[PDB]
Design an enzyme around this catalytic site. Structure first.
Site, short mmCIF file in Angstrom:
data_model
loop_
_atom_site.label_atom_id
_atom_site.label_comp_id
_atom_site.label_asym_id
_atom_site.label_seq_id
_atom_site.Cartn_x
_atom_site.Cartn_y
_atom_site.Cartn_z
N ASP A 25 0.81 -1.22 0.00
CA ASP A 25 0.00 0.00 0.00
C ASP A 25 0.84 1.27 0.00
O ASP A 25 1.33 1.69 1.05
CB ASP A 25 -0.91 0.02 1.23
N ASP B 272 -1.60 5.63 -5.17
CA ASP B 272 -2.01 4.75 -4.06
C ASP B 272 -2.29 3.31 -4.52
O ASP B 272 -3.36 3.01 -5.05
CB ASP B 272 -3.25 5.37 -3.40
#
EC number: 3.4.23.46
Lengths: 374, 7
Positions: free
Chosen positions: A35, A220
């Site tokens: 992430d 992201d």
């Protein structure tokens, strides 16, 4: 030279990409979602209906309790847990072992996913956004501080069982074609960037660039969709509809509330437009553009029918360049030089007529003004 | 879908 790190990611479409990480002593290996949108390393550490395994701290001789709780909220879900440190290696990553902070997740809400095969999350962004505060050193910071590994990693996310590569400490040239083009990291918190122009099938959306970055734009890997601020989303949908007008779709399709399915192998990719984002370049008044296909923004939902969800969606927290964007490209997180590189991915999903692209340079004036300020 | 930090 980085061949052993190639193909070190796996995943299920729409459920993130994970890498194996080995924690503690004797070794406990877990699958960890990568992430770039957060900065905490956290692993399931207690039974959960959706976990098949978890970190067992009492069995790790090298575990050190930090005697402090930690809580991290994400867009929909959250978890609570306990901080400690332990030895961590990435067996298909760099040949080192570091002592890293680890949040042992004991309770959670809408975080783990039924059947996803991953058991934790690796937040690769910067300390500023770590919980409980910026004093909790993120994993990659520990890696760079404790070892020789260069301060850079790169991600090739290969869409649809998905896979890809996380190259740690460098760049592998087999993963991309053409040139790498770099955009500055605006500020070291999220991987924040500046979008300066948006086009649908070559047609300028014609909004003020300040709208594209209100209140931030970030890269992201833990978010599936390309998420856009409401005004931008609304304009983008209007333009995408116009470009694909040879076909009719319900209003709810564009809102992600309805799926549309085609008979196996008949999806008319050609009737949907390409989408380009121009990013600030490394030279004054210079930009470049990345272009994705419907193969990136129409996502398969798993018979003889291929169902798809429109994966561009609305945001109230700025633009999020998620997997929809990243799956077109090899993306280089060059922390050492405060920049993010994009090149056409050798693995990206395309067809015989169109390919994702990274092109430049272009001339774009007053790009500095595009960014949001408090 | 996944939608990883609040903020």
């Amino acid at each position: 030279s980085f061949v052993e790190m190639v193909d070190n990611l796996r995943g299920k479409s729409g459920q993130g990409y994970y890498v194996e990480m080995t924690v503690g002593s004797p070794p406990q290996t877990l699958n960890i979602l990568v992430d770039t949108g957060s900065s905490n390393f956290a692993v399931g550490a207690a039974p959960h209906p959706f976990l098949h395994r978890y970190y067992q701290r009492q069995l790790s001789s090298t575990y050190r309790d930090l005697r402090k709780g930690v809580y991290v909220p994400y867009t929909q879900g959250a978890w609570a847990g306990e901080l400690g440190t332990d030895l961590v290696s990435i067996p298909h990553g760099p040949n080192v072992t570091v002592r890293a902070n680890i949040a042992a997740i004991t309770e959670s809400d809408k975080f783990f996913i039924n059947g996803s095969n991953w058991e934790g999350i690796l937040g690769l962004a910067y300390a500023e956004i770590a919980r409980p505060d910026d004093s909790l050193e993120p994993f990659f910071d520990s890696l760079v501080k404790q070892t020789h590994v260069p301060n850079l990693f790169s991600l090739q996310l290969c869409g649809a069982s998905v896979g890809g590569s996380m190259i740690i400490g460098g760049i592998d040239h087999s993963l991309y074609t053409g040139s790498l083009w770099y955009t500055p990291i605006r500020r070291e918190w999220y991987y924040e960037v500046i979008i300066v122009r948006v086009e649908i099938n070559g047609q300028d959306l014609k909004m003020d660039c300040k709208e594209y970055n209100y209140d931030k734009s970030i890269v992201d890997s833990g978010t599936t969709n390309l998420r856009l601020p409401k005004k931008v989303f609304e304009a983008a949908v209007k333009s995408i509809k116009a470009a694909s007008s040879t076909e009719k779709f319900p209003d709810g399709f564009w809102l992600g509330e309805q799926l549309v399915c085609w008979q196996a192998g008949t999806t008319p990719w050609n009737i949907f437009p390409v989408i380009s984002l121009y990013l600030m370049g490394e030279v004054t008044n210079q930009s470049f553009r990345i272009t994705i296909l419907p193969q990136q923004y129409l996502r398969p939902v798993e018979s003889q029918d291929d169902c798809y969800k429109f994966a561009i969606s609305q945001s109230s927290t700025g633009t999020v360049m998620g997997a929809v964007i990243m799956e077109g490209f090899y993306v280089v997180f060059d922390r050492a030089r405060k920049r993010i590189g994009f090149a056409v991915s050798a693995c990206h999903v395309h067809d015989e007529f169109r390919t994702a692209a990274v092109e430049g340079p272009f001339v774009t004036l007053d790009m500095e003004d595009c960014g949001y300020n408090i | 879908x996944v939608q990883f930090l609040a903020x």
